[PDB]
Design an enzyme around this catalytic site. Structure first.
Site, PDB file in Angstrom:
ATOM      1  N   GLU A 124      -4.372  -6.777  -0.601  1.00  0.00           N
ATOM      2  CA  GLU A 124      -5.611  -6.723  -0.608  1.00  0.00           C
ATOM      3  C   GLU A 124      -6.161  -5.709  -1.607  1.00  0.00           C
ATOM      4  O   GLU A 124      -5.437  -5.120  -2.499  1.00  0.00           O
TER       5      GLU A 124
ATOM      6  N   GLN B 228       0.697  -1.074   0.041  1.00  0.00           N
ATOM      7  CA  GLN B 228       0.020   0.063  -0.058  1.00  0.00           C
ATOM      8  C   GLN B 228       0.724   1.209  -0.022  1.00  0.00           C
ATOM      9  O   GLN B 228       0.591   2.321  -0.704  1.00  0.00           O
TER      10      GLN B 228
ATOM     11  N   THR C 287       3.365  -7.440   2.838  1.00  0.00           N
ATOM     12  CA  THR C 287       3.809  -7.637   1.360  1.00  0.00           C
ATOM     13  C   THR C 287       4.819  -6.568   0.880  1.00  0.00           C
ATOM     14  O   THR C 287       5.234  -6.690  -0.113  1.00  0.00           O
TER      15      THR C 287
ATOM     16  N   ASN D 118       4.892  11.932   0.358  1.00  0.00           N
ATOM     17  CA  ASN D 118       5.104  11.368  -0.812  1.00  0.00           C
ATOM     18  C   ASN D 118       5.420  12.221  -2.110  1.00  0.00           C
ATOM     19  O   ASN D 118       6.033  11.579  -3.148  1.00  0.00           O
TER      20      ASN D 118
ATOM     21  N   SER E 199       8.023  -0.653   1.657  1.00  0.00           N
ATOM     22  CA  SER E 199       8.316  -0.214   3.084  1.00  0.00           C
ATOM     23  C   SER E 199       8.690  -1.237   4.006  1.00  0.00           C
ATOM     24  O   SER E 199       7.839  -2.261   3.945  1.00  0.00           O
TER      25      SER E 199
ATOM     26  N   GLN F 198       0.976   4.568  -3.003  1.00  0.00           N
ATOM     27  CA  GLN F 198       1.036   5.948  -2.708  1.00  0.00           C
ATOM     28  C   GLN F 198       2.408   6.760  -2.982  1.00  0.00           C
ATOM     29  O   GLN F 198       2.426   7.895  -3.217  1.00  0.00           O
TER      30      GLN F 198
ATOM     31  N   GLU G 108      26.555   3.660 -13.784  1.00  0.00           N
ATOM     32  CA  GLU G 108      27.830   4.376 -13.367  1.00  0.00           C
ATOM     33  C   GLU G 108      28.087   4.629 -12.039  1.00  0.00           C
ATOM     34  O   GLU G 108      29.073   4.708 -11.683  1.00  0.00           O
TER      35      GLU G 108
END
Lengths: 129, 425, 430, 87, 107, 439
Positions: free
Chosen positions: C62, C11, C136, C219, C131, C15, C245
């Site tokens: 989900e 999730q 998941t 975000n 994260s 985002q 590089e």
């Protein structure tokens, strides 16, 4: 420049414009006045032609007279010396080709357009008027 | 994905029928069962608690199990009674009669062979089954005794699903049954083993809320079931409404119960406000954390200041900001740190749902797991063993098909459980 | 030709990616419906009628977090076959996302990953977004990168993460996921960036004046850091560096691939009238200790290297003045055996600005990537919060019950404990 | 106005409608509903267009004092909170 | 702040004392109302304007709005003694209004 | 390039900074939004403002000033005044609780919370520098953060910066008029700290400017605006040779070389000579002579001390306007010929002369006139010892019974710092007997 076809195919698919045709070869030594048909396909602005035969003429059966293609504006043009007919240009071979930022393989070939042809006017069809 | 909602008892129907007046107002559904709502998220995840029938109508997923036909005939003629399908009102002929052994052993065991036919029918019409529910009170023998035999046979058919039970456990102060401790001591013998989840509601503290903070002169049994129904929907709102942060039904059961026997919770509700002090009250995120956590506003009458919090929830509901939500869970934990266990270094679980309860700008809902739930279990066993030492009312149970050693077997499992809460304090 | 596919897990990973893909649309000309009204090919495929499909795949267990991407303003932008969605959620369980539900989707996502990279000409990078809190984002991500470690080979696989903070957290289990996920990220990622949520709340409060920053403002700052790495893929620079590089130049050893990030002008638009925003003014705002992205003080650290990335109105003669300034101040400490110390990157295209965003339209911008020994104290904090609860087995009954042995809890402790002494033995001088 | 094929949600009359592609059924159902009423104020499918004193100028981003109704506005810059509180 | 009501209707009795031209406002006790009821305004002379003029019994009739301390009271009816008194003093009484029903109390 | 950073502390120090910055913005062409109007511009190039102002791409002029205060209110009239946009927002710094008229509160308990912010802002106004001539501070000895935090301000600037010059314009207490009971306890300890860290110190008490407003002008009942408007005329004339071209000019390190003979005697006085209302200015010659001996009027000095009791050490002269160099020398030779003006034995020259070209500007709303010449005096007498014989008297008049001492001890301050500062201030009393008596 644009090398795109899909928008015009989705917009003008089955639409053609048909003109009947008369052509006086009676100025020549033995030709009769001829009746032809000229179709013009709006999907890609391409022209085809066919002959309409009378009841009493000794001509063979023709389903075409030329090819469904683009017709040049002036004369039977000299588009010879092959290699110039490619539309996109290249810079090197690295196949995988790299587009050249200049454009050198370009010749200004003009074609008939739906803006060009109309009723009651005269044009040039492969050296024939 | 979706849940089937069992209801058991004269408390269980009166708990359960108010919940369907609550959650069908989440989704714009009039009493005949048709949608008449005002947003497309009122309709988008409606299959979590429903099944669909022809003509633009939705029916719930509920069976209504009773041991007297007169206690659902009022439920079938309420304002929201005709929503239910009448095929699964499966009901008994003779009464259990505040008797455990006449619900478990003698009389309800003929009925539960027929209850399983519709709960197997409501659990094959699915996409991927998620869980069940159960509303019952731990005082009687229709809500309490058959609901125990209900759970174990659901458990052997659907053993990897989620089981919830919403208990209304008996109170110390005034008892509306002489034989209450013989019910609730043998009852929790199977809420320690046969279920994934169980809550704990006292009627002693539902009176305490409805007099101290709500200023009601006279609360009926409709205003008390307004309090239960506004929490039984607060744990199933990540499951049918989108969130900034998500914690659905499975996500809290893994995350809160530290050891596989300690699953007795104690809920509250944050914006509970008196009708005269609604005007003089601001609603910010600190005004929910101040009222979720204070010991007045609990619904379980087990004082958290007398013990250690083990794991603590909060399912917020509104449009909040993720710093200010996570700030207050840090601010409270650092202020009074003696009340929280130290070998779990952050006792916080957090969720934010974007769709408020209707009419409210912001809400919150709390699930404590304190140490002091043993004072519920200890005070049952102090007034159970007064009666059982002289064997007061024992002949009504022993004459219905159960032995004598089963009661001192049940006093093992309850008085084991009190030690396992002192163990981790 | 500069192909690069980004897969989003979690999730949180969506985002994050919902802000990156509203940044890559505005950076070029394209609209939410995919149609422009030369160098998009790094991140957009090419179909017929003027569409450009993103080179992305959004996978989360989900359904309720992808279903507002399926109905949001970007319905027609993503091809529907990419948005892979499961049925039952991991529910803050590394075991349940790696062993139980992750096995029912790893067959399907790798079909979409194969169907993307056979269309590609030549591939540089995967950019996975996740994260270190939940299931998941931690478990499925681990199974994703041992499939990709052997199905694809030596294609570079980047790793943008979020570390769990010291104090401000949102789960009681967050140490258990983040010591079992360093076991598998170490052998498979080539560069793994960490930005924890705690420090951005400070920078959003005093540099930007946003009291109460919601995750939408959080975000919108990560997407500038991902974009500034990849402006040298998509644009033309006076001194450019590709994604291949600077992976060589940033890491000393095959276990020390954990760099920090810092974006220098992060300034509100009312307080950006009054500031000059010169090159030597924002070169040293990268090394300011109150502007870092992870709560670990660089004054206790010892710098291995630094990868400055500049973009805008920067001239290389103004770059070399500020680099000579930092090497003379004595509160900044580079190691004994890194005398050069820097990797300059100068680009022409300014960073684009999102309307409704929070920053200012600035002519110059710096993104910085440092590798310090200062993260020894961000891994010696959360290692205690692991075994504060593991010393009498809190929350182990859930993880064991669906596919994990008891020994792998401590198999990954030592591989995080032997991880720690490699930062003690890299900072010593002669 | 339709739904994309992978969509996992509720569409009315979808089970009874048959014999078409999924997007074609969703477009035809969302176009009109003879059996029921579709809500007027909806927010899933939206049109795609590219992402005395004390005015907003009379202060600084470090100013201390009381601004009315500006403790309930969140996720915005300080001058933006002050601007949409005062105006 | 209420989800259940946007406004409430509060019934009050206004008493005017002919001895000293003082007035008092008293809310009758209603079971289950949940609000502090009884003496809303103590017996005192009510000011009509910023000039310090007081309300006289001549200013009071059925269908008049009485504004005191920022609250506006709609006079709906009067008792029989008040009716007979005002008519005996040459005041024609307006027709009796109905008190509007409180939506909350009805629900 | 000739830059000087200004710092201001306290309610006295902010309200000086309003009067000085209305002066500089009208001395150059700055409007209260920040920029020259681009319709009409007054003469001069980029050089005339870079001592004080800054620049951006658009053409703003952000001053190099920071305002420091320990309460919200007095800063917030700058933030809502007519100069709200001309100051950058982080430069106006503000605490939460003021020091409550304690030296100890602003120096030990509360000052530690705003010493961390105010030392990154100077390092943001000195990194954009190229060559900095020296800071200026503005405070009052009687206050709580004008005494407590300001002593804490000067110490961290002596360490982190070095021998960079730090001027101070201060407000000494009056001999008998005061607004606070505690004022002996502040002006002893803050004099003990600012001895070793300040390079020059132009003390001025408010009772003397009360006396020359009512007498030289006609203004009876003056407020602190008329008090602060005359103070900025003296602050600007020190730095008037930094900004504008002069016939013979002096910088900030020129007068420290000449006035201060020994490293603790750095307390000059101040006198601004033509102080005339506009109804009297145009009937007077106001020549170089008439505004030179008026600086030597003992009723026109700006500290209530009398220079007939003392020996002149070294006098600075700051001439601006229509001043020819040859007429300064005529009026100088009158003064040394006159015998009621007494100098020390070991200084026979006794004079520094500075001549500028720019006449002093007029503030509308102000009370002084437009004049063609002015003189600013920076004398140095041994007669300032009599203004400490009545400060040490009012200190031990309280302190020998320990009045108000418990208010200062419980703020992290031990009781030994009162006996420390009393003996050091008594050391400077005998340093002025020793220096000022004949060989």
């Amino acid at each position: 420049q644009s090398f795109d076809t899909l928008k015009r195919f989705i917009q003008y698919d089955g639409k053609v414009l048909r003109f009947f045709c008369l052509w006086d070869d009676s100025t020549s030594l033995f030709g009769d006045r001829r009746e032809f048909v000229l179709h013009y396909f709006l999907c890609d602005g391409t022209v085809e032609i066919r002959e309409v035969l009378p009841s009493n003429s000794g001509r063979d059966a023709m389903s075409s007279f030329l090819r469904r293609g683009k017709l040049p504006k002036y004369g039977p043009p000299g588009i010879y010396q092959p290699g110039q007919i490619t539309d996109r240009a290249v810079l090197n071979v690295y196949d995988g080709y790299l587009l050249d930022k200049y454009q050198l393989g370009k010749v200004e070939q003009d074609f008939y357009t739906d803006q060009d042809l109309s009723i009651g006017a005269t044009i040039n069809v492969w050296g024939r008027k | 994905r979706e849940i089937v909602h069992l209801q058991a008892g004269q408390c269980g129907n009166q708990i359960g029928a108010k919940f369907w007046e609550v959650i069908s107002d989440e989704h714009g559904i009039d009493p005949t069962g048709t949608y008449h709502g005002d947003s497309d998220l009122q309709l988008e995840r409606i299959n979590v608690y429903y099944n669909e029938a022809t003509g633009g109508k939705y029916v719930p997923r509920a069976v209504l199990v009773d041991l007297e036909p007169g206690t659902m005939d009022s439920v079938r003629s309420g304002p929201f009674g005709q929503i239910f399908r009448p095929d699964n009102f499966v009901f008994g002929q003779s009464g259990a009669g505040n008797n455990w052994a006449k619900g478990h052993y003698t009389e309800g065991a003929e009925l539960v062979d027929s209850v399983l036919d519709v709960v197997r029918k409501e659990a094959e019409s699915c996409d991927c089954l998620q869980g069940f529910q159960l509303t019952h009170s731990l005082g009687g023998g229709t809500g309490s005794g058959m609901g125990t035999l209900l759970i174990s046979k659901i458990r052997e058919e659907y053993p990897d699903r989620i089981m919830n039970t919403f208990s209304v456990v008996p109170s110390p102060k005034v008892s509306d049954t002489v034989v209450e401790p013989y019910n609730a001591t043998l009852s929790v013998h199977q809420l320690v083993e046969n279920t994934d989840e169980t809550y704990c509601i006292d009627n002693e503290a539902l009176y305490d809320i409805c007099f101290r903070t709500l200023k009601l002169t006279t609360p009926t049994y409709g205003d008390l079931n307004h309090l239960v129904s506004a929490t039984m929907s607060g744990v199933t709102t990540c499951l049918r409404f989108p969130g900034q942060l998500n914690a659905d039904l499975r996500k809290l059961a893994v995350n809160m119960v530290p050891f596989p026997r300690l699953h007795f919770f104690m809920p509250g509700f944050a914006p509970l406000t008196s009708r005269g002090s609604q005007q003089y009250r601001a609603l910010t995120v600190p005004e929910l954390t101040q009222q979720m956590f204070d010991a007045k506003n609990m619904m379980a009458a087990c004082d958290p200041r007398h013990g250690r919090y083990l794991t603590v929830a909060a399912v917020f509901r509104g449009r909040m900001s993720m710093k200010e939500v996570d700030e207050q869970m840090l601010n409270v934990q650092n202020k009074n740190s003696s009340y929280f266990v130290e070998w779990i270094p952050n006792n916080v679980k957090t969720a934010v749902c974007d769709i408020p309860p209707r009419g409210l700008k912001m809400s919150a809902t709390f699930i404590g797991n304190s140490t002091a739930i043993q004072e519920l279990f200890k005070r049952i066993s102090e007034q159970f063993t007064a009666m059982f030492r002289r064997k007061a009312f024992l002949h009504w149970y022993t004459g219905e098909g159960m032995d004598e050693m089963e009661f001192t077997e049940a006093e093992s499992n309850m008085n084991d459980l009190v030690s396992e809460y002192q163990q981790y304090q | 030709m500069r192909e690069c596919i980004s897969i989003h897990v979690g999730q949180a990973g969506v985002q994050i990616g919902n802000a990156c893909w509203e940044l890559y649309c505005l950076e070029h000309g394209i609209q939410p419906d995919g149609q422009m009204p030369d160098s998009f090919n790094t991140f957009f495929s090419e179909t017929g009628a003027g569409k450009h499909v993103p080179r992305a795949v959004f996978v989360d267990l989900e359904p309720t977090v992808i279903d507002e991407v399926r109905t949001g303003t970007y319905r027609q932008l993503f091809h529907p076959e990419q948005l892979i969605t499961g049925k039952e959620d991991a529910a803050n369980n590394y075991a349940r996302g790696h062993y139980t539900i992750g096995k029912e989707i790893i067959d399907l996502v790798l079909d979409r990953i194969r169907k993307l990279a056979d269309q590609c000409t030549g591939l540089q990078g995967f950019l996975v977004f996740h994260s270190f809190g939940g299931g998941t984002g931690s478990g499925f991500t681990s199974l994703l990168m041992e499939r990709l470690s052997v199905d694809y080979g030596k294609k570079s696989k980047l790793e943008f993460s979020i570390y769990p903070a010291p104090q401000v957290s949102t789960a009681v289990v967050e140490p258990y996921n983040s010591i079992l996920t360093t076991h598998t990220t170490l052998e498979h990622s080539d560069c793994a960036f960490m930005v924890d949520n705690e420090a951005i709340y400070d920078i959003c409060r005093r540099n930007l004046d946003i009291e109460r920053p919601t995750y939408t403002n959080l975000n919108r700052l990560i997407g500038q850091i991902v974009s500034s790495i990849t402006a040298s893929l998509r644009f033309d620079g006076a001194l450019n560096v590709d994604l291949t590089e600077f992976q060589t130049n940033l890491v000393p050893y095959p276990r020390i691939h954990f760099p920090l990030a810092t974006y220098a002008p992060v300034i509100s638009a009312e307080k950006a009238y009054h500031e000059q925003l010169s090159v030597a003014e924002i070169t040293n705002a990268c090394f300011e200790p109150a502007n870092q992205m992870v709560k670990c003080d660089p004054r206790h650290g010892k710098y291995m290297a630094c990868c400055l990335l500049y973009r805008g109105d920067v001239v290389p003669k103004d770059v070399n003045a500020a680099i000579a300034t930092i090497k003379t101040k004595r509160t900044i400490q580079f190691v004994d055996w890194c005398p050069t110390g820097f990797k300059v990157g100068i680009n022409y295209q300014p960073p684009t600005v999102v309307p409704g965003g929070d920053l200012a339209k600035v002519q110059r911008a710096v993104c910085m990537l440092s590798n310090t020994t200062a993260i020894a104290e961000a891994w010696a904090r959360l290692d205690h919060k692991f075994d504060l609860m593991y010393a009498k087995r809190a929350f182990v009954h859930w993880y064991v019950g669906e596919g994990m042995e008891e020994g792998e809890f401590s198999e990954a402790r030592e591989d995080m404990a032997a991880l720690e002494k490699d930062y003690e033995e890299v900072g010593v001088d002669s | 106005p339709h739904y994309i094929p992978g969509y996992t949600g509720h569409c009315p009359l979808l089970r009874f409608s048959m014999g078409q592609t999924y997007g074609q059924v969703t477009g035809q159902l969302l176009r009109g509903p003879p059996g029921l009423a579709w809500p007027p104020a909806h927010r899933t499918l939206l049109p795609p267009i590219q992402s005395h004193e004390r005015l907003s100028s009379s202060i600084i981003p470090g100013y201390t004092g009381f601004i009315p109704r500006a403790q309930f506005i969140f996720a915005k810059n300080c001058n933006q909170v002050w601007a949409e509180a005062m105006s | 702040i209420s989800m259940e009501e946007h406004y409430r209707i509060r019934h009050v009795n206004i008493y005017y004392y002919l001895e000293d031209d003082s007035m008092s406002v008293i809310e009758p006790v209603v079971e289950n109302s949940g609000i502090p009821q009884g003496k809303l305004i103590k017996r005192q002379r009510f000011t009509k304007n910023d000039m310090g003029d007081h309300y006289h019994w001549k200013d009071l009739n059925r269908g008049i709005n009485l504004t005191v301390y920022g609250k506006t009271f709609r006079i709906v009816d009067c008792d029989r003694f008040t009716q007979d008194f005002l008519e005996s003093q040459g005041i024609e009484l307006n027709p009796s209004e109905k008190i509007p029903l409180d939506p909350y109390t009805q629900l």
